[PDB]
Design a binder for this molecule. Structure first.
Ligand SMILES: *[C@@H]1O[C@H](CO)[C@@H](O[C@@H]2O[C@H](CO)[C@@H](O[C@@H]3O[C@H](CO[C@H]4O[C@H](CO[C@H]5O[C@H](CO)[C@@H](O)[C@H](O)[C@@H]5O[C@H]5O[C@H](CO)[C@@H](O)[C@H](O)[C@@H]5O)[C@@H](O)[C@H](O)[C@@H]4O)[C@@H](O)[C@H](O)[C@@H]3O)[C@H](O)[C@H]2NC(C)=O)[C@H](O)[C@H]1NC(C)=O
Ligand SMILES: *[C@@H]1O[C@H](CO)[C@@H](O[C@@H]2O[C@H](CO)[C@@H](O[C@@H]3O[C@H](CO)[C@@H](O)[C@H](O)[C@@H]3O)[C@H](O)[C@H]2NC(C)=O)[C@H](O)[C@H]1NC(C)=O
Ligand SMILES: *[C@@H]1O[C@H](CO)[C@@H](O)[C@H](O)[C@H]1NC(C)=O
Ligand SMILES: *[C@@H]1O[C@H](CO)[C@@H](O)[C@H](O)[C@H]1NC(C)=O
Ligand SMILES: *[C@@H]1O[C@H](CO)[C@@H](O)[C@H](O)[C@H]1NC(C)=O
Ligand SMILES: *[C@@H]1O[C@H](CO)[C@@H](O)[C@H](O)[C@H]1NC(C)=O
Ligand SMILES: *[C@@H]1O[C@H](CO)[C@@H](O)[C@H](O)[C@H]1NC(C)=O
Ligand SMILES: *[C@H]1O[C@H](CO)[C@@H](O)[C@H](O)[C@@H]1O
Ligand SMILES: [Cu+2]
Ligand SMILES: [Cu+2]
Ligand SMILES: [Cu+2]
Length: 539
């Protein structure tokens, strides 16, 4: 045993960075939270607008726990005109499928005025976030940080916490979805760094453009090592995070600690997390913090202003004049060779499932996976179907059945022709990136080039534009697991499928069945007279 400290971050008592957290979990304590999903008004960047929030702030409240703790999170929907459903990003939910928070898959939506208590253990440590998985709501601010303390692969002195990177509209995403769904994501009006940015309201006629937005600011004390927890939570944003004249030591990706590597800039797709350690070893000055919005990935009206300020002297009010590192300027992820899990694991014998992304136009632009666009019924989520002993699901549920070759390699191909790098998120599992390739998948040749020996391992990874992503995971978590592009427009357009894994091995407590039933009962009481019907894929 050793205690975690600034000079022994690898330690976690009897556990450590070498503990297999897929197999072993510390005993912790029960932590209880009450969250209210609210319809709010905020001014994050000098522009006043509506938001959908947890507890009236963007980001929502931090949920901070220790590895092994049991979370009880009472979520009350205080919106009037939407259901909601809260997902705990990257959280494995082993034995707690029904609290994954995917409406249409693991639950019915929480109706206005209802409460759903999510219960789960955190059997993972690091940086993640929680967010609505109900339509585009997280675009309107319905997300917050979820930090699980545990060991780390490099030493550091202070944890500064999360820095959210996002696009930010000056109106509700729900006002622009009808335009967006014609096929083209709109250029949004601004970006936020940890919930703030400047915006020039000086020439504006819009009463809501009140001005006074401020750059995100981060203060460093010289010689101190800081852990920063980077999350891209935009609707349709790509970042290449950098701090001028500072080196990032990358120590985790998503909820998987990695062998540390140094980089000047850090490519981050939507829903991806990185933990980096930054040593405040520069000349004391103000330095630009650069989101480096990927303009080739998607449009924004104020791409150049996706920045913040690092100060070594907090009393400085000067803008930085530092010179940035030339960004790679791509929509890629970090290179696979750089992302080596500290806890080394290999992909065993597998069955290969191949799926192909294309697009179509029905009522509006849709993405398809083997010709089918995901469209879920919020009143008949996949788990309800499973509880009713159904093994054949609607075509548009895009179900792939997995049954145990205890591993699956899932290859998703971009046949769309658009060359977009789609951040693909898999629920219920960390996956192994056996291939992430900019080329055409050849079912006879490509598999022999898969890396099965400790490849990158995480829960969000890019489908390369016009290429393929081959992700492996073990049949170790019975349930119904959504996989989707995390570009909110694309998710809403049906770029998604789901794995019904080991169906007959799913076990739910009567307590949790009653709860699920009750949520669906309340949802069904709501829908007859709702102001708004489902008008997207449901996820
Ligand atoms: C980007 O922007 C975000 C702001 O949006 C910034 O987030 C900040 O991130 C930092 C670092 O990650 C956080 O600092 C840490 O905060 C920890 C918690 O601090 C607070 O809560 C403590 C616990 O309070 C509960 O427990 C005690 C018993 O121990 C009770 O007395 C108390 O009533 C609470 O009980 C309730 O909750 C527990 C579950 O949590 C239940 O089980 C109970 O039944 C009950 O319902 C409290 O003692 C303390 O005084 C604080 O209120 C702290 O442990 C840690 O050491 C550190 O301070 C910030 O909290 C976070 N700020 C926000 C607003 O989220 C972020 O830093 C920024 N990034 C950058 C780079 O600037
Ligand atoms: C959840 O709640 C939001 C309200 O916060 C609903 O948003 C509304 O969505 C409708 C249907 O897309 C929007 O109507 C469209 O608006 C634009 C407005 O300029 C117009 O071009 C279109 O022809 C159409 O009328 C409406 O703007 C929007 N309302 C707000 C306040 O944003 C959303 O539908 C709800 N979804 C669910 C599933 O309950
Ligand atoms: C969030 O807001 C709700 C409703 O006011 C309140 O009951 C709950 O205690 C709040 N939770 C936090 C974490 O502030
Ligand atoms: C949020 O409140 C606004 C303003 O009252 C209203 O237009 C909107 O429908 C509400 N949205 C939801 C999802 O309840
Ligand atoms: C945005 O950046 C441009 C330079 O890229 C700068 O000239 C302009 O004043 C900035 N706007 C805001 C609101 O900070
Ligand atoms: C999807 O279609 C491709 C091309 O026809 C086929 O090879 C693949 O097996 C299909 N996948 C599934 C799960 O049906
Ligand atoms: C589903 O099958 C199980 C196992 O045979 C049975 O116990 C249960 O009653 C069935 N569920 C429904 C909804 O009929
Ligand atoms: C991560 O590591 C790989 C392999 O060394 C490099 O190629 C990459 O540039 C980054 O440093
Ligand atoms: Cu997510
Ligand atoms: Cu996409
Ligand atoms: Cu998801």
């Amino acid at each position: 045993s050793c205690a975690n400290s600034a000079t022994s971050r690898s330690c976690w008592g009897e556990y450590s960075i070498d503990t297999n957290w897929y197999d072993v979990t510390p005993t912790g304590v029960t932590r209880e939270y009450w969250l209210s999903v609210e319809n709010s008004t905020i001014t994050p960047d000098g522009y006043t607008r509506s938001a959908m929030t947890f507890n009236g702030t963007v980001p929502g409240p931090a949920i901070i726990a220790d590895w092994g703790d049991n979370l009880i999170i009472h979520v009350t929907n205080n919106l009037e005109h939407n259901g909601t459903s809260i997902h705990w990003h990257g959280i494995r939910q082993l034995g707690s499928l029904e609290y994954d928070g995917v409406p249409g898959v693991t639950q019915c939506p929480i109706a206005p005025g209802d409460t759903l208590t999510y219960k789960f253990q955190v059997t993972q440590y690091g940086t993640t976030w929680y967010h609505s998985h109900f339509s585009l709501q997280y675009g309107d601010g319905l997300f917050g940080p979820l930090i699980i303390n545990g060991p780390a692969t490099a030493d550091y002195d202070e944890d500064v916490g999360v820095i959210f990177l996002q696009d930010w509209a000056h109106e509700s995403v729900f006002e622009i979805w009808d335009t967006a769904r014609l096929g083209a994501p709109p250029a949004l009006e601004n970006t936020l760094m940890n919930g703030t940015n400047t915006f020039d309201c000086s020439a504006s006629t819009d009463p809501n453009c009140v001005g006074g937005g401020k750059k995100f600011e981060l203060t460093f004390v010289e010689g101190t090592k800081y852990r920063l927890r980077l999350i891209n939570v935009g609707i349709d944003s790509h970042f290449e995070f950098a701090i001028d004249n500072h080196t990032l030591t990358v120590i985790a990706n998503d909820l998987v600690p990695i062998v540390p590597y140094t980089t000047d800039t850090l490519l981050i797709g939507i829903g991806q997390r990185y933990d980096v350690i930054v040593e405040a070893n520069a000349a004391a000055d103000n330095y630009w913090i650069r989101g480096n919005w990927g303009t080739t990935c998607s449009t924004n009206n104020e791409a150049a202003n996706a920045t913040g300020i690092l100060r070594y002297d907090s009393s400085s009010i000067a803008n930085p004049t530092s010179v940035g590192t030339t960004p790679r300027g791509t929509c890629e992820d970090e290179p696979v060779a750089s992302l080596v899990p500290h806890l080394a694991l290999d992909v065993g014998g597998y069955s290969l499932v191949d799926e192909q992304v294309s697009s179509a136009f029905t009522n509006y632009f849709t993405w398809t996976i083997n010709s089918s666009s995901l469209l879920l019924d919020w009143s008949s989520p996949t788990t309800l179907k499973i509880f009713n002993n159904e093994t054949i699901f609607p075509t548009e549920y895009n179900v792939v059945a997995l049954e145990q070759e205890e591993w699956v390699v899932y290859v998703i191909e971009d046949l769309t022709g658009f060359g977009i790098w789609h951040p693909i998120h898999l629920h219920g599992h960390d996956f192994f990136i056996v291939a992430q390739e900019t080329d055409v998948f050849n079912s006879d040749e490509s598999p022999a080039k898969f890396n099965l020996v400790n490849p990158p391992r995480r829960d969000v990874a890019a489908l390369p534009g016009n290429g393929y992503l081959a992700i492996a995971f073990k049949l170790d978590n019975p349930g119904s697991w959504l996989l989707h592009c995390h570009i909110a427009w694309h998710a809403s357009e049906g770029l998604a499928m789901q794995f019904v894994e080991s169906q007959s091995s799913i076990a739910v407590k009567m307590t949790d069945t009653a709860i699920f039933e009750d949520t669906c009962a309340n949802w069904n009481a709501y829908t007859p007279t709702q102001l708004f019907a489902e008008d997207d894929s449901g996820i």
